[PDB]
Amino acid sequence: GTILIDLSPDDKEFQSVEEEMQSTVREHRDGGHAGGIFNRYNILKIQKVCNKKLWERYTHRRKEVSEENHNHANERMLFHGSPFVNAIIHKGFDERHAYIGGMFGAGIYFAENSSKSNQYVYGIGGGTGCPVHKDRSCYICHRQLLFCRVTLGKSFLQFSAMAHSPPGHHSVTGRPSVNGLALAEYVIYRGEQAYPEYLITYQIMRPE
Ligand SMILES: CSc1ccc(-c2nc3ccccc3c(=O)[nH]2)cc1
Ligand SMILES: [Zn+2]
């Protein structure tokens, strides 16, 4: 049921998605071990992910959350990196896409910083890097990330350095408490609370 529509680089929607990607790169405490060394990306393609059934699955859940939270879904646009990006865009998020060992429990994790999600494209800790060169910092191989619509509802705030949501909450927010430049990371425990809106194909760029 999924079709992928290419956005033109001239389209305002391409441009605003690229800007969110590029502007939320930061340096990471691993010095680039997991995701590579780079300050920016070469965006090769941005596609909109269209699946009626998956969209309706998302909106149904969004309304349930909204009605439990004074008509406020608390919807965000967040990045997701994963070895399973191809299954997600065809079958939706579910328990098989969860970070079982994540610091907020087994759930599906999203980031404000695109460079955080980039660390998971080739697996946890960057796995063994690109399939072809076994390089976590490969500047040649094409990578993919998702830019997703995520319903947070009432989010449990964790001030820090599939399971269930904390009672009375719909998600967890990991607030950065040491690295003053890091943006927030979020966890949902129901695959229905996210829709994979954009598929972004890119390379990390070697700093000059
Ligand atoms: C099913 S195996 C797996 C494990 C971890 C992640 C992941 N973890 C994150 C943790 C924090 C922020 C973003 C992410 C993120 O974008 N992805 C994706 C898939
Ligand atoms: Zn490579």
Swiss-Prot record:
Per UniProt, residues of the PARP catalytic domain are 8-208
Regarding how it is modified after translation, the entry says: Ubiquitinated at 'Lys-48' and 'Lys-63' by RNF146 when auto-poly-ADP-ribosylated; this leads to degradation. Deubiquitinated by USP25; leading to stabilization. ADP-ribosylated (-auto). Poly-ADP-ribosylated protein is recognized by RNF146, followed by ubiquitination.
Q: Residue span of the signal peptide, if any?
A: none
| Localisation | Cytoplasm; Golgi apparatus membrane; Nucleus; Chromosome, Telomere
Which tissues and organs express this gene's product?
Highly expressed in placenta, skeletal muscle, liver, brain, kidney, heart, thymus, spinal cord, lung, peripheral blood leukocytes, pancreas, lymph nodes, spleen, prostate, testis, ovary, small intestine, colon, mammary gland, breast and breast carcinoma, and in common-type meningioma. Highly expressed in fetal liver, heart and brain.
Where Zn(2+) is bound, by residue? C130, H133, C138, C141
Question: According to its UniProt entry, what is the function of this protein?
Answer: Poly-ADP-ribosyltransferase involved in various processes such as Wnt signaling pathway, telomere length and vesicle trafficking. Acts as an activator of the Wnt signaling pathway by mediating poly-ADP-ribosylation of AXIN1 and AXIN2, 2 key components of the beta-catenin destruction complex: poly-ADP-ribosylated target proteins are recognized by RNF146, which mediates their ubiquitination and subsequent degradation. Also mediates poly-ADP-ribosylation of BLZF1 and CASC3, followed by recruitment of RNF146 and subsequent ubiquitination.
The family note in this entry says:
Belongs to the ARTD/PARP family.
What's the subunit arrangement here?
A: Oligomerizes and associates with TNKS. Interacts with the cytoplasmic domain of LNPEP/Otase in SLC2A4/GLUT4-vesicles. Binds to the N-terminus of Grb14 and TRF1 with its ankyrin repeat region. Interacts with HIF1AN. Interacts with RNF146; this interaction leads to ubiquitination and proteasomal degradation. Interacts with NUMA1.
Protein known as = Poly [ADP-ribose] polymerase tankyrase-2
Q: Which residues of the full protein are shown?
A: 952 to 1161 of 1166
